[PDB]
Structure 1
Amino acid sequence: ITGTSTVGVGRGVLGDQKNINTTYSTYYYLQDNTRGDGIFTYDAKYRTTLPGSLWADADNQFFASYDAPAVDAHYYAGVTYDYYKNVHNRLSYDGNNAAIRSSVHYSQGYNNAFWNGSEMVYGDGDGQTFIPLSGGIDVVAHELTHAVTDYTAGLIYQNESGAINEAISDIFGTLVEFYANKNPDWEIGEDVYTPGISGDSLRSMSDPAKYGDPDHYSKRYTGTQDNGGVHINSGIINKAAYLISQGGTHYGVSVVGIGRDKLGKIFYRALTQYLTPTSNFSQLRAAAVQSATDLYGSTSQEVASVKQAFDAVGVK
């Protein structure tokens, strides 16, 4: 749409009030002109046909309950862009300011979100397992990070390389959650998962085992479901990532933590310079050590902590 950049106000899924960037042309659209080539939020109207309609509102006020998921998808996509640009010097998911598109109200009671190769898609949840998915900032950054991975390493969505793909999304969605200082933790989807149960999450980075995910290479899932456990085996990597940043003793192996900032730097460098579509866990180790070496020197504490970490989780 061609129009005047203005700013609207709305309420998110969690009932929080926020200002969003909009465009005026007869109607007020959910189109942010301030970021790259723009952030566009669409209404899929409970259908599966994408992208649906560019979101139009009559008064620039987004307080209806139907508006909630749109506000959040729009706002959080903005934050994610900002994180990439500010922290890693990367312009949009392609590094070239490509437009970011998201569709909300996908299907009926759809309990998931995904990057389909060209845009983000968000279900509303069935109201018990999940509430509208764009209400979680870690969810939104996990999804956009899939776009990043697609344009960089291009990790295939299956087996070890798919678990890596999943873990990077979880790592960067957590980093984005800390970046925004939005009640940060090392958990995944806590804000939109099981509205009736407190203190739970979809996955844990700090202790993947809490939910039945492997926290050691010896415990890896070798089967066939979930594209060969792309969401299962990611726990081995998430645990490793957690230990480099925070430190700790896992299975008798002690890791000195080097913090979140440095974790994000080594991982981004591994992703964009060393990882390929067919990388495996053992190649991620090599890639991480090498990024750490480039950045901090071979004899650094950083390099030392990345090695311990992978050793703690049985990766090499």
Structure 2
Amino acid sequence: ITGTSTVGVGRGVLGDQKNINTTYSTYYYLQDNTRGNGIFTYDAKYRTTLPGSLWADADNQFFASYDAPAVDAHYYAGVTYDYYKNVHNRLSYDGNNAAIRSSVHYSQGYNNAFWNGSQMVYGDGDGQTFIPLSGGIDVVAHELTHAVTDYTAGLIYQNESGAINEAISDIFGTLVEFYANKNPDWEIGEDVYTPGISGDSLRSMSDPAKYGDPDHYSKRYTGTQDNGGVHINSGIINKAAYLISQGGTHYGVSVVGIGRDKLGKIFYRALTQYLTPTSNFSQLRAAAVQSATDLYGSTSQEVASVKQAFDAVGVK
């Protein structure tokens, strides 16, 4: 809608207070005009028709429990946007400041979130396995990263190419979590997963195996479930990226860590200049090698670490 840019305040899913960019025109809307062509957050009203209604509020104060997921979806999309602009000089997911749109209160008891090709979508969780999924910044940044991947490498969402797609979303979700820097970790979804159990998460990048995901290529899933294990085999790439950044010795193979920012640079470059819709793990290894070479030189420590990290997870 057309209006003046304004600033509201609310409480997010975890009870934390934050400012949000809104637009005023009779009502206050969750429309942030400060970022590209704007960030727009919608109410799906417990149904599955999308997007639903542009979120409208009477007083620009968002402290109702019904408001919390919208507050986080709107705010964390702004954070993710800032990451791509400030760190990789990328304007929104298409690189040309596309409007970023998200719907919350999708369905009833829906324990997931997704990018539907055009927008982000967040369930409320059933209150047991999940609370409202937009509560996790790794989750938001994971979903928005799919839009990024889909406009750039266009990794097809099955088998190894799908695993790569899912891993890139875990990687940049995590890197965005660390960018916002609020007890960040190498875990995925800890903030919105199982409110009754502390310390757990949906997936782990530092220890994929913790949750039964492969941390080495010899252990890859080869069946047909999960589109050929796109959320399972991502663990092999997640561990590679964890190693690249943090270092370690994994199955006897030592890796000298190069830190988070360099991991991001290498993987952003691979994603945007070398990956294709059909790339498999082996081609991912080359893309990352070629990226690090470009960025730091063929004799660098960086290129050396990319090689050992992929050696370590069994990817040749």
Q: Normalization by structure 1: what TM-score? A: 1.00
Residues of 1 paired with 2:182 and 2:277: CA distance?
32
C-alpha distance in 2 between matches for 1:183 and 1:264: 19
Deviation (angstroms), 1:38: 0.2
- Deviations for 1:54-94, whole angstroms, at most 9, x for unmatched residues? 00000000000000000000000000000000000000000
1:233-253 CA distances to partner (integer Å, 9 max, x unpaired)? 000000000000000000000
Deviations 1:22-51 (A, max 9, x none): 000000000000000000000000000000
Match of 1:111 in 2: 111
What CA distance in whole angstroms lies between the structure 2 residues aligned with 1:89 and 1:31?
23
Q: In the TM superposition, what is the alpha-carbon distance from 1:299 to its structure 2 partner?
A: 0.3
Deviation digits for residues 109-155 of structure 1 (CA, Å, limit 9, x no counterpart) = 00000000000000000000000000000000000000000000000
SS of corresponding position for 1:196? coil
What is the CA–CA distance in structure 1 between the aligned matches of 2:116 and 2:93, rounded to whole Å? 14
Deviations 1:177-231 (A, max 9, x none): 0000021000000000000000000000000000000000000000010000000
Please tell me whether residue 256 in structure 1 is matched to residue 265 in structure 2. Answer: no
Kindly state the Cα deviation for residue 9 of structure 1 after the two structures are TM-superposed. Answer: 0.1
Mapping for residues 50-69 of structure 1, pairs under 5 Å: 50-69=50-69
Q: After the TM superposition, which segments of 4 or more aligned residues of structure 1 sit over 6 Å from their partners?
A: none
The residue number in structure 1 matching 2:164 is: 164
Instruction: Give, in whole Å, the separation in 1 of the partners of 2:53 and 2:65.
Output: 18
- Separation in structure 2 between the aligned mates of residue 276 and residue 45 of structure 1, nearest angstrom: 37
Give the superposed CA RMSD.
Answer: 0.3
Q: What's the TM-score once normalised by structure 2's chain length?
A: 1.00
Q: Whole-Å Cα distance in 1 between the matches of residues 183 and 118 of structure 2?
A: 30
Q: Secondary structure at the match of 1:77?
A: helix
Unaligned runs of 5+ in 2: none
> How far off its partner does 1:156 sit?
0.1
What secondary structure does 1:267 align onto?
helix
**C-alpha separation between the residues in 1 aligned to 2:221 and 2:44?**
36
Q: Distance in 2 between matches of 1:220 and 1:194?
A: 27
Instruction: Give the Cα separation in 2 of the matches to 1:23 and 1:293.
Output: 45
Distance in 2, matches of 1:201 and 1:130, equals 10
1:246 alignment counterpart: 246
CA displacement at 1:305 relative to structure 2: 0.2
1:245 aligns to what SS in structure 2?
Answer: helix
Mapped to 2, the partners of 1:98 and 1:204 lie a distance apart of: 31
* Structure 1, unaligned runs of 5 or more: none
CA distance in 1, matches of 2:140, 2:3: 27
Distance across 1 between alignment mates of 2:183 and 2:93: 25
User: How far apart in 2 are the matches of 1:39 and 1:204?
Assistant: 29
Aligned residues: 316
